[PDB]
Amino acid sequence: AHEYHNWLRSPFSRYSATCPNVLHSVMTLAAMLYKISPVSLVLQTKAHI
Amino acid sequence: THCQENSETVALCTPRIVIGNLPDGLAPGPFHELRTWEIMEHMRLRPPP
């Protein structure tokens, strides 16, 4: 039950509870795993995402 | 409402347990259908299966 130390927390389960069972929901679950590292900020920002 | 009893006329009050019990002039059928569409959009069932 150690939520605070898990990787995937409450927003993920709340999202997958309601989301329609289609391809884009899978893709956006994948996009929800983009990291919060500063190097990831450089890489995402240079991609203009 | 007013009601009859054994040699008596009495007043009766009871609760409207569900919202559907409101008179249709005060909450009509099209309104209930639209409110249902609202709840369905809330649960992401906007186009239902």
Q: Could you write out the three-class secondary structure of chain B?
A: CEEEECCEEEECCCCCCCHHHCCCCCCCHHHHHHHHHHHHHHCCCCCCC
CB A19 within 8 A of CB B44: yes
Q: Which chain A residue lies closest to B40 (C-alpha atoms)?
A: A18
In angstroms, the CA A22 to CA A20 distance is: 6
> CB-based contact (8 Å) between B44 and chain A?
yes
In angstroms, the CA B11 to CA B1 distance is: 6
Say whether B43 and A20 touch across the interface (CB within 8 A): no
CA A1 vs. chain centroid, Å, equals: 20
Say whether A19 and B44 touch across the interface (CB within 8 A): yes
Compute and round to an integer the Cα radius of gyration of chain A.
Answer: 13
Give the contacts of B40 (CB within 8 A, at least 6 positions apart). B46, B48
Total residues found in chain B within this entry: 49
- The candidate with the shortest Cα–Cα distance to B31, out of B23, B15, A44, is B23
Angle, helices A23-31/A10-18, rounded to nearest 10 degrees: 170
Residues pairing with B11 in the sheet: B2
Element (H or E) spanning A36, and its range?
none
